[PDB]
Structures are given as C-alpha cells and as structure tokens.
Amino acid sequence: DLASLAIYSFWIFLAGLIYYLQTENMREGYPLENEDGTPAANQGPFPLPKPKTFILPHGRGTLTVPGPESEDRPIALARTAVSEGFPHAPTGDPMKDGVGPASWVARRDLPELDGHGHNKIKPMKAAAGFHVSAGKNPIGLPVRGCDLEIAGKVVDIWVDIPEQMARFLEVELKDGSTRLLPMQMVKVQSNRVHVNALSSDLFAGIPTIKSPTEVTLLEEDKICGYVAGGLMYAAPKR
Amino acid sequence: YQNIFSQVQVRGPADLGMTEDVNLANRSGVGPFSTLLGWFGNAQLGPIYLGSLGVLSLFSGLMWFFTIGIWFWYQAGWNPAVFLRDLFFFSLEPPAPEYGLSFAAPLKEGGLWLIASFFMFVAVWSWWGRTYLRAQALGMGKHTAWAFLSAIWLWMVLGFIRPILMGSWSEAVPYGIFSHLDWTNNFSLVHGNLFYNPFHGLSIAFLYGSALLFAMHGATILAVSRFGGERELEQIADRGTAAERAALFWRWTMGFNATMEGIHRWAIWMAVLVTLTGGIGILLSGTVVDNWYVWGQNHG
Amino acid sequence: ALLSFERKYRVPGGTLVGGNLFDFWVGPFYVGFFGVATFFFAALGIILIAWSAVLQGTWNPQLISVYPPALEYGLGGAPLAKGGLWQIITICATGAFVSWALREVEICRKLGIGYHIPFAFAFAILAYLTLVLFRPVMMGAWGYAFPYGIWTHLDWVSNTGYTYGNFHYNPAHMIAISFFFTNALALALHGALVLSAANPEKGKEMRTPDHEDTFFRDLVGYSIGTLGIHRLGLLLSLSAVFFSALCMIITGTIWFDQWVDWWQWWVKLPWWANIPGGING
Ligand code: BCL
Ligand code: BCL
Ligand code: BCL
Ligand SMILES: CC[C@H]1c2cc3[nH]c4c(c3C)C(=O)[C@H](C(=O)OC)c4c3nc(cc4[nH]c(cc(n2)[C@@H]1C)c(C(C)=O)c4C)[C@@H](C)[C@@H]3CCC(=O)OC/C=C(\C)CCC[C@H](C)CCC[C@H](C)CCCC(C)C
Ligand SMILES: COC(C)(C)C/C=C/C(C)=C/C=C/C(C)=C/C=C/C(C)=C/C=C\C=C(C)\C=C\C=C(/C)CC/C=C(\C)CCC=C(C)C
Ligand SMILES: CCCCCCCCCCCC[N+](C)(C)[O-]
Ligand SMILES: CCCCCCCCCCCC[N+](C)(C)[O-]
Ligand SMILES: CCCCCCCCCCCC[N+](C)(C)[O-]
Ligand SMILES: CCCCCCCCCCCC[N+](C)(C)[O-]
Ligand SMILES: CCCCCCCCCCCC[N+](C)(C)[O-]
Ligand SMILES: [Cl-]
Ligand SMILES: [Fe+3]
C-alpha cells in the first residue's frame, strides 16, 4: 500500500541526506592526521567531497575547499606520553606561543570589508557620526584586571559600522601605547571596566595592531586568542 | 559576561542597505530606532520594500483577517463586551459536507469561509513570490523561498489538497482559536490516533531536533563570540579560531563536528523536514489510511 | 586521529576533578572524570534495562518497557520486578545526564570558551527531572512518572493528556507550543539566510552580512542581525522547554480538573458574565 511505499522511500531519502550533510561538513580539517601531522590510516566511511570554490568579494580571490591544509605557523608543544591521546605540553609561554586556549589561526592579514568594500571595524573617533546611544559610555573608565590592579584607561570604542555594534575597547597602558580588548571579555561597571581573563601585568603582552585605525583578521585572532588564554594561564593571579 | 544582552549600544547614520538590482523607488525611508530592540539585536526599523506583490499580499492578508473579524462581530451580536468575552470561542466554520467542493454555499453556512480562504490563498502565494524576488534583486540563493515552500506544503494540504481529495471543504480547518484546537484533537480520534502515523512521529523528531539544534548552535556561537564567531560568512571564507573551537567542542563531546557553512545545512534541513514529513502524514490520513492503529497492525 | 588544526588545542588542564588522571582522549572523544562517571552510570543503566527485559520475558526493543512503581507504593521503594528497577535506572539516567553536562564544562575550560552549551543542556535535564522526580513527588507517588519503553511512553502521554480533557487547553502548553513552532521557523530562516549569502546565484561573489540585513529589511522591515539571531535561537528553544516543564508541574498539582474548564475565569468576570448573545449565554 501507498503509505508503506512512502515511509520506506522517506527512510532511503533521509539516509542519502545524512550522507550529503556529513560529506559537506568535511570541507575543513580533513583528512584526519596522526599526532605527528601524517595522514591517519582510518578516515572513516565517508569520502572527501568534490571541491567547491567561493568567489570572495572586493577582488580578494577564491577559496577552494577541501584543499591543502597547513597551520602555516610553528606549534610550541611536546608529547607527554609514548602513545596516542594524551595532552601536548607547552614548551615555552603558552600565551606568547599561542597554544591551548591562547591559540590563534593564520587568517588573512587584511581587515574584514563591508558590502561597499570599506573596513568593517573602525575606531569610533574615525566613524562619522557613530556615538554611544544607550548604556554606560566606557570611554574614560579605568580598566582593572583579575588581580584587582588598574592596567589602563578606555580611550575609544571600535565599532562594526554595518551592524552598528561595539566589538573592541581601545585601552591606553602605563607607557602610552594602546591595546584592543574584545567587548565580550569585559564587564562595563559604573566606575570601571573589569577584565577577568587577564591580570594587570599581562596587558602589555596583548598583541599590537600595525595600523592605528584598522585591525586585520590575523590580528583579531591573535588578540582574542591571547585574552581567552588568560582564563587558564593568568589563573595563578586571579 | 554572557553576551545575551549588549552592555553598550552605538548608533550611526541610518543604513539604507545594499542596492544591487533592487528598485530603490519601492523602498520606504528608515523608521525610528528602538533602544529596546537594540539591547538584543539591531535598533533600526526599516526601510521596508513594498512593490506590487507586497501591496497585493498585504491587502489580501488584511481582507482574510477582517473577513474572519466581521463574522466574529456578527456572532457577538455587535456587543464589544461579548466580542472580548467570547474571542477564543468564535469560529468561521467551512461549508457543511452537503455542499461538497461547490462554491454555492450561503455566506452564513460556509460561503464566508471560502471568501476568507481565497484571500488567504492570494496573501501567502504572493508573499512566497516576494521571498524569491527580494533574494533575486540582491543576487542571493533562493534558500528562503525553498524553505518557505515546506511550510506552504502543510498549510496547502490541510486547507486545499486534502479537502479536494476527500471531496468536500467540510474537511478543512475552521478560523478560530479554540475551534482549530478541537479540529486538531478531532482529526486524531477520527483517524485512530496520530501517534501511530509514522510521518507524525518523524515530524515530532524534527520539531524536537530543531529546538535541540538551535539550542546547540545559538549556545555555540555565543560561547565563541569572544573570537568573532557570529561573523559566520567571513569564518566560512577564512576559518578562524572561533570555527576551530566550535568544531572541537562538539568533536570532543560526541565524536564528530560541523563546518561553519555545514551547520547551516543541518539547520535548514532539520527545520524544513518538520512540515515536509507532517504534510505527507496529513495527506495520507483519510485518503489512503482511515485508521493508523489498524494500518500499524498490518505494518502496511 | 585529529582534525588538521586540532593539536594546538590538546593541552593539559581545565579539569574540575582528578587533575591530570583522566585528562586524555579516546579517538575524538575527551574523557575527564565525568567521562568515566558517564560510562559507569550509562553501563549500569543498560545492564539494569537488560535484567528488566529478562523478568518481562522479551528481547524485542519495541516491547521492552520498564514501569514505575504502582500508585499504592507512593514515594517508597518497590521490589525490582514491580518498579524498583525503574527507580534505580532513573538514578543512573540522572547520573549520566548531569555527568554529561559537567564533562561539557571541562571541555569548555580546556578550549577557553563560554559555558552556554551545558547551561542550555541543563534545561533538557530539568524537563526530564520534572516528569520523573518533581511532579511525581508533589503528587505523592512515583507511579505518575512515565515508563521507559518506545511505545508505552506514548501511551502515557495520551492517557496523561486525556485525564484533563483535550490537553490543548492547558495555557502553559499553548505558550510552549508557540515557542517550539517559532523556534523551527527561526531555525529555517537562519539556515536559509546564511546559505543564500555563502551560495549566491551561479558565478556571483559571496554576499556580505550587509546583504543579509538588507534582504530581511526589504522583506519584513526589520533585521535582528547576526548576533541577535543566535541570541533569539537560544532563547526560543530554552523558553519552549521552560514552558513545557511549567505546563506539567501545574497539572495534577494546583490544577487537576478538565483544562477546558479553567477558561471560565475569563468568561465569568462580573462585567460581562451575564450579557446575552455570543457563544457563552
Ligand atoms: C517530550 C515529551 C514526552 C515524550 C513524547 C513523545 C512523542 C509524542 C513522541 C516521542 C518520540 C520519541 N521519544 Mg519521547 N517523550 C518523552 C521523553 C523522552 C525521553 C527522555 C525524557 O528521556 C527520550 C530519550 C525520548 C525518546 C524518544 C524517541 C524514541 C522518539 C524520538 C525522539 C526525538 O527524535 O527527539 C529529538 C532528538 C534527536 C533527533 C536526537 C536523537 C535522539 C535519539 C533518536 C533518541 C534514542 C533514544 C533511545 C531509543 C533510548 C534508549 C537508549 C539507551 C541508551 C538504552 N522521549 C516525554 C515523556 N516522544 C516520537 C516517536 O516516534 O516515538 C516512538 C514521538 O512521536
Ligand atoms: C490530540 C492531538 C493529536 C495531534 C494531532 C495533530 C494534527 C491533526 C496535526 C498534528 C501536527 C503536528 N503535531 Mg501533533 N498531535 C498530537 C500530539 C503531538 C505531540 C505530543 C503529544 O507531545 C507533539 C509534540 C505533536 C507535534 C506535532 C508537530 C510535529 C506537527 C505540526 C508541525 C508544525 O510545525 O505545524 C505548524 C506549521 C504550520 C501549520 C505551517 C503554517 C504555514 C502557513 C503558510 C503560515 C500562514 C501564516 C498566516 C498568513 C498568518 C500570519 C500571521 C502574522 C503575519 C503574524 N503532536 C495528538 C496525538 N498533530 C500537524 C502535522 O503535520 O501532523 C503530521 C497536524 O496537521
Ligand atoms: C493527547 C496528547 C496531548 C498532549 C499531552 C501532553 C503530555 C502529557 C505532555 C505533553 C508535553 C508537550 N507537548 Mg503536548 N499534548 C498534545 C498535543 C501537542 C501538540 C499538537 C500539535 O497537538 C504539540 C505541538 C504538543 C507539544 C508539547 C510540548 C510543549 C511538550 C513536549 C516537549 C518537551 O517537553 O520537551 C522536553 C524534553 C525532554 C523531556 C527530553 C530530555 C532529554 C534528556 C535530558 C536526555 C536524554 C538522553 C538520551 C537518553 C540519550 C540517547 C542516547 C544517545 C542517542 C547516544 N503537544 C495532546 C493534546 N503533551 C510534555 C511536557 O510538557 O513535558 C514537560 C508532556 O509531558
Ligand atoms: C533545551 C532545548 C533542547 C535540548 C538541548 C540540548 N540537548 C543536548 C544538549 C543541548 C544544548 C547537549 O549539549 C547534549 C548533546 O551532547 O547534544 C548532542 C544534548 C543531548 N540531548 C539529547 C537528547 C534529547 N534532547 C532532547 C530535547 C532537547 N534538548 C530540547 C528540545 C530530546 C527530546 C526532545 O526528547 C532528546 C531525546 C542527547 C543526544 C544529548 C545528551 C546525551 C547524554 O546525556 O549522554 C549521556 C547518557 C547516555 C549515553 C545514555 C544513558 C542511558 C541511561 C542510563 C538509560 C536510559 C534511560 C532513559 C530514560 C531511557 C528512556 C527511553 C524511552 C523514553 C524511549
Ligand atoms: C477588532 O476588529 C477588527 C476590525 C480588527 C477585526 C478582527 C479580526 C479578528 C479578531 C480575527 C481573528 C482571526 C483568527 C483568530 C484567525 C485564526 C486562524 C487560524 C487559527 C488558522 C488556522 C489554519 C488555517 C488553514 C489551515 C488554512 C488554509 C487555507 C488554505 C490552504 C486556502 C484554501 C483556499 C480555498 C478553499 C479557496 C480556493 C479558491 C479558489 C478559486 C482557488
Ligand atoms: C541524528 C543524526 C546524526 C548522526 C549522523 C551520523 C554522523 C556520523 C559521522 C562520523 C564522522 C567520523 N569521522 C571519522 C569522519 O570524523
Ligand atoms: C526579544 C526582543 C526584546 C528584548 C528586550 C529586552 C531588554 C533587556 C534590557 C537589558 C538591560 C540592560 N543591561 C543592564 C543588561 O545592560
Ligand atoms: C516587524 C515589524 C517592523 C516594521 C517596521 C517598518 C518600518 C516602516 C518605516 C516607516 C517610514 C515611512 N516613511 C514613508 C515615512 O519613510
Ligand atoms: C537531519 C536528520 C536528523 C536525524 C533524526 C532522526 C530521528 C529518528 C526518529 C525515530 C522515530 C521513527 N518513527 C517511530 C516515527 O518511525
Ligand atoms: C539513532 C541515533 C543514534 C546515533 C548515534 C551515532 C553517534 C555517532 C558517533 C560518531 C563517532 C564515530 N567514530 C568513533 C569513528 O569517531
Ligand atoms: Cl527561560
Ligand atoms: Fe549561525
């Protein structure tokens, strides 16, 4: 009967859809590797899909996935055991080396562009006429780290122009240079900005940007990586 | 800090948006900015695009709504105290089984149901056309229109396709708050309990799965928002530590993972399969299977 | 084996219990203390369900059903054959689910991400504990809990619902359904939008978030934005389950009559209770 034919058909369709969906989710990070970077013997039952090519806007070229995968950076880790599946210990300073929760990816060293090909993220001082419209304005507040010591002062907000939101606080340190802190890792209070992730002595080590009025995808990844790594690595001084 | 609500709002000039091949003559101007909305999402209201299809859908949609409303007022003996008291109990019912698929039923006994339904039919389909055309004008894929078609399938089956195959409009759903719940309950009893309909069971699994998946996906993107996770398109074009930590959370938890693009393929399908399997389950009820208990006993 | 990018993240630390003892992986799976707790709770639970299948005299997964104690046991222990296995399996299931949550927290800490996922999962656990622990205890017997079997638990949904007439009329049930339906609508739109931007018309450049904002303003006059839709999805789906738990915690406890009759509070308000015409008079 028709209902029997329909339910049987539906289960065959669904098995094909799951096959299609799983192969689509293998366009990054595959093939699988041994801890030494060599291709693993066992890849599982699903094959790599045929490559697709994204045409990136604003003349920034193409991306073909799957494609050749490398970290394009040195990984300061060593094995802690003689067999697979144990942790890899940092060989230096995991915050400086960018491993564990302080990891960053070698994204393009260009800033994200909006739909008109202008920089997505600008300091508010250079964004006509963006202003704080609601909530406490953090500009001028001292910044305190998890050691309850003052590390600097907020001197601007970096804004996403197309989405009209705050992405970083620009902080001025004791020595007059600035750092970006991601908005999602600070608490704005009436009389201060508080940073759980970092102690005061770790603010100077936040990676610097190379232009004062733009931030690149690579730089965002180094800054956000570094600040998140403080949750684990600044924990002796919280 | 959890990133459920913004700590600071910023505002700049109203965003009139991208042009591409859009006819700007048919865009309104920006509406006001809502500080309230701005704690959770965007403050900007408008602009909206209103071409000929937009006006047709909006007028038609209001005629469907007003047609039900005038019938509710009639039923309330034009008394605003009764209208409010009995609001959930009013019902515009379809024509009786006697009139079959005929458009000849008097207003007070199902003619008004057919008029409201006609208006609803124009409203929904013109709105479908609008989701396709607004995507075309911006050069985007038609994902939204194909996904909407899945909702339209279940609606089309309940009110149109199934009533036609059964040979009467009496089989269609009445316009009323409590009356459409009674119809839903009644439908299950008459067809020997829908829990035995395997398509109804799959629909539930996908409805469930949609809540599981958006809980997972929403939580995941907020957990990696400290590395710019919500910027999903640029993370597709150039994988960052946000996409890597998101993948590895799930790999380490349950043994497999998604890409930043691929999670949206899981998302669109989990959702469309709700109304897809649902519409099939309803289409087969009373047309092919009188009783799901009985069918289940023969597995066939 | 590892994803191409995985090794830099497999560092020591982030454990809540046992320091470095369980700080390792088995294939892709992270272990931790709460991985060991999950296996123990899950394994003991599966054995007990097998031992239940024996006493019932069936190995068919479509017939195996583990029933709570009968009502006359109230909130006491029961013999294994008559509800005791259910009681122990329920402690094992609660043990496995809480352990799974705390294991998600350990993975969060190693990866330096927020705790939103195990927070969200805790809402599923609360719905489960509502049906098997909170409602039964408030009602005064384990017997009001649902049985563990594929078809017998649907039988319980049907019998529990119809005890109160058409269960549609539970107002907390109405709100819960509204969130479930809205969440699925929102998930379809979110998936469709991102895919429509990443995968535009053949030969065109990838669209921008600005295209996604513009699409929705053109269509309905509002865009909630890329951060907003992820906030929305978390909120719709946690709300659906919150109102689900609420609709059952009030059923058989503060309200135990037909749900349809509850709506008489509205109709019998004195300023329109006695006005002729309409449906109610
Ligand atoms: C939620 C309100 C009701 C309820 C009312 C209904 C109704 C109505 C239906 C179901 C249906 C199902 N219910 Mg139920 N169900 C309830 C509580 C549960 C609980 C629990 C709280 O522990 C579980 C594990 C289940 C599990 C199930 C599945 C067998 C099935 C599809 C679920 C799904 O796709 O979800 C979404 C989740 C996913 C897509 C992720 C995958 C989850 C997998 C599929 C679960 C497998 C569970 C396994 C068989 C249990 C044994 C495993 C042990 C380790 C041995 N229900 C309560 C009592 N349930 C449907 C069915 O078809 O029943 C036959 C159906 O129509
Ligand atoms: C006593 C009641 C019966 C029962 C009888 C039915 C009947 C009858 C049906 C379902 C259907 C469903 N049931 Mg059931 N169901 C029962 C018990 C359950 C239980 C449970 C016990 O826990 C659950 C979880 C469900 C869950 C479900 C869903 C999976 C499914 C509806 C999917 C959907 O999203 O439609 C909601 C979405 C739509 C209806 C699409 C609408 C699209 C249109 C285009 C929107 C127009 C909008 C309009 C213009 C207004 C504009 C508004 C303004 C602009 C704001 N049922 C019991 C056994 N159930 C449906 C189904 O598919 O069955 C297989 C269905 O027809
Ligand atoms: C005739 C039946 C009645 C009815 C009687 C009831 C009764 C009785 C109940 C509901 C409940 C619900 N009803 Mg009702 N309901 C009816 C008709 C409907 C219709 C419809 C369209 O007609 C809809 C859409 C609904 C929808 C709903 C939801 C609001 C709710 C179920 C979701 C939930 O609680 O998730 C919560 C999720 C869970 C409980 C899952 C928890 C998962 C746990 C934490 C993890 C499991 C892990 C697993 C074992 C692992 C598997 C192994 C792995 C795969 C490896 N009902 C009709 C009128 N309804 C239920 C409710 O609100 O419960 C609180 C409920 O008890
Ligand atoms: C709160 C919103 C939604 C939600 C969220 C949610 N669920 C989650 C998560 C989140 C955020 C996870 O992180 C977690 C996960 O890992 O997802 C892949 C999970 C999860 N949600 C799951 C299931 C699930 N979620 C559901 C629902 C929902 N989860 C909500 C709709 C449902 C429904 C609707 O029924 C189910 C079935 C799992 C896939 C997973 C949790 C897995 C877990 O805890 O593993 C440890 C335990 C075992 C390996 C099994 C132990 C077995 C027992 C000891 C014995 C059996 C007892 C049981 C009572 C049998 C009853 C069976 C009968 C009823 C048929
Ligand atoms: C206060 O007063 C004012 C003026 C504001 C008016 C008030 C209005 C009010 C209070 C309105 C309330 C309306 C309500 C509560 C509506 C509820 C509707 C519900 C619950 C709908 C549920 C389901 C509907 C379905 C399934 C409809 C399906 C319809 C179709 C598929 C269309 C079928 C078309 C047909 C039969 C005609 C086709 C004809 C031709 C020629 C093609
Ligand atoms: C509820 C449906 C979701 C489950 C679908 C099954 C997907 C399993 C894929 C395993 C991938 C393993 N591997 C080696 C490729 O990483
Ligand atoms: C769902 C859309 C509307 C949501 C509006 C909710 C407003 C929340 C207000 C938060 C208060 C501001 N604060 C103190 C968190 O910065
Ligand atoms: C989802 C509800 C949001 C609706 C917002 C629509 C805003 C309309 C803008 C009105 C401005 C009209 N005009 C001609 C003065 O520019
Ligand atoms: C996107 C695909 C996700 C796969 C989810 C599959 C859930 C299985 C549901 C089993 C219910 C089967 N039943 C009894 C209704 O025939
Ligand atoms: C019926 C739904 C249950 C489906 C559960 C499947 C879980 C997939 C686990 C993937 C792990 C594969 N592995 C071990 C090769 O990595
Ligand atoms: Cl809540
Ligand atoms: Fe997303």
**Cα A4 to Cα C125: distance, rounded to the nearest angstrom:** 36
Residue to substitute from B206, B238, B249, interface A, most A β-carbons within 10 A: B238
CATH no., domain A121-234: 3.90.50.10
- Residue A75: both structure tokens together: 């990984």
* C222 close to B32: Cβ distance less than 8 angstroms: no
- Residue C103: both structure tokens together: 């294991």
CA distances from A44 to A48, B210, C30 (A): 10, 27, 19
Residues of A in contact with C3 (CB under 8 A): 28-30, 32-33
Q: Nearest CA to CA, how far is C32 from chain B (Å)?
A: 11
Please classify residue C111 by burial: count the beta carbons closer than 10 Å to its beta carbon, then call 0-12 exposed, 13-18 middle and 19+ buried.
Answer: buried
Which residues have a Cβ under 8 Å from the Cβ of C18 and sit 6 or more positions away?
C32, C33
Dihedral angle of Cα B272, B275, B280, B285, to the nearest 10 degrees: 170
Ranges of each domain in chain C = 1-163, 164-263
Helix (H, G, I), strand (E, B) or coil at B140: coil
Other C-beta atoms closer than 10 Å to the C-beta of A189 total 13
- Residue A197: both structure tokens together: 């992730």
What's the distance, CA C170 to chain centroid? 19
What's the distance, CA C268 to chain centroid? 37
* A216 close to A110: Cβ distance less than 8 angstroms: yes
Q: What's the CA-to-centroid distance between C138 and ligand 3, angstroms?
A: 20
Which residues partner with C125 through β-bridges? Answer: none
Closest listed residue to residue B82, CA positions, set C123, C279, A181: C279
What amino acid is encoded at C201 in this protein? Answer: E
Residue A119 phi, psi dihedral angles, 5° rounding:
-55, 130
What amino acid is encoded at B277 in this protein? Answer: T
Asked whether the CA dihedral B97, B102, B106, B107 is positive or negative, the reply is positive
Other C-beta atoms closer than 10 Å to the C-beta of A235 total 12
- For the Cβ of B270 lying below 6 angstroms from any atom of ligand 9, the answer is yes
Ranges of each domain in chain A = 2-102, 121-234
Helix (H, G, I), strand (E, B) or coil at B49: strand
Q: At the fourth CATH level, which superfamily is domain A2-102? A: Photosynthetic reaction centre, H subunit, N-terminal domain (4.10.540.10)
**Cα B243 to Cα B241: distance, rounded to the nearest angstrom:** 6
- For the Cβ of B32 lying below 6 angstroms from any atom of ligand 8, the answer is no
Q: Nearest CA to CA, how far is A16 from chain C (Å)?
A: 20
First and final C-alpha spacing in chain C: 73
**Helix A2-24 × helix B198-223 angle, to 10°:** 20
Helix (H, G, I), strand (E, B) or coil at C200: coil
**Cα B28 to Cα B33: distance, rounded to the nearest angstrom:** 15
Query: Which residues in chain B are followed by a discontinuity, with C-to-N distance exceeding 2.5 angstroms?
Result: none
Taking phi over 0 as left and psi of -120 to 50 as alpha, with beta for the rest, A85 belongs to: left
- Residue B224: both structure tokens together: 């990696």
A28, A88, A163 member nearest C225 (Cβ) = A163
Which residues partner with C251 through β-bridges? Answer: C255
C201 at interface of A, judged by CB pairs closer than 8 A: no
**Cα C35 to Cα C28: distance, rounded to the nearest angstrom:** 13
DSSP class of A166: E
Contact A164 B11 (CB under 8 A): yes
- Method in brief: X-ray
Residue to substitute from B7, B199, B232, B256, interface A, most A β-carbons within 10 A: B7
**Cα C46 to Cα C68: distance, rounded to the nearest angstrom:** 17
**Cα B68 to Cα B70: distance, rounded to the nearest angstrom:** 6
For chain A, what's the residue count? 238
What's the distance, CA B17 to chain centroid? 26
Among the four given CATH numbers 3.40.50.1370, 3.30.70.2740, 1.20.85.10, 1.10.260.40, the one describing domain B200-283: 1.20.85.10
Closest listed residue to residue B97, CA positions, set B107, B89, B105, B87: B105
Q: Quick one: chain A helix, strand, coil %, rounded to 5?
A: 25, 25, 50
- For the Cβ of B105 lying below 6 angstroms from any atom of ligand 4, the answer is no
* A171 close to A154: Cβ distance less than 8 angstroms: yes
* B247 close to B258: Cβ distance less than 8 angstroms: yes
List helix spans (H) across chain B. Answer: 35-38, 52-75, 80-85, 111-137, 143-156, 162-166, 177-190, 198-223, 232-237, 241-254, 262-283, 292-297
* B157 close to B279: Cβ distance less than 8 angstroms: yes
Strand A165-173, strand A150-160: pairing: antiparallel
Look-up of token digits 């609508």: C185
- Residue B76: both structure tokens together: 């309330």
CA distances from C13 to A231, A232, A233, A235 (A): 11, 8, 10, 11
Please classify residue C127 by burial: count the beta carbons closer than 10 Å to its beta carbon, then call 0-12 exposed, 13-18 middle and 19+ buried.
Answer: middle
Other C-beta atoms closer than 10 Å to the C-beta of B247 total 27
- Residue A22: both structure tokens together: 């799983």
**Cα B26 to Cα C211: distance, rounded to the nearest angstrom:** 17
Please classify residue A197 by burial: count the beta carbons closer than 10 Å to its beta carbon, then call 0-12 exposed, 13-18 middle and 19+ buried.
Answer: buried
Look-up of token digits 């990443």: C198
Which architecture characterizes domain B52-190 according to CATH? Up-down Bundle (1.20)
Q: Which chains touch C (3 or more CB pairs under 8 A)?
A: A, B
Residue A53 phi, psi dihedral angles, 5° rounding:
-120, 120
**Cα B277 to Cα B157: distance, rounded to the nearest angstrom:** 12
What amino acid is encoded at A160 in this protein? Answer: D
Helix (H, G, I), strand (E, B) or coil at C112: coil
Q: Which residues of B119-142 are buried (b: 16+ CB within 10 A; e: fewer)?
A: bbbbbbbbbbebbebbbebbbbbb
- For the Cβ of C248 lying below 6 angstroms from any atom of ligand 4, the answer is no
* A81 close to A73: Cβ distance less than 8 angstroms: no
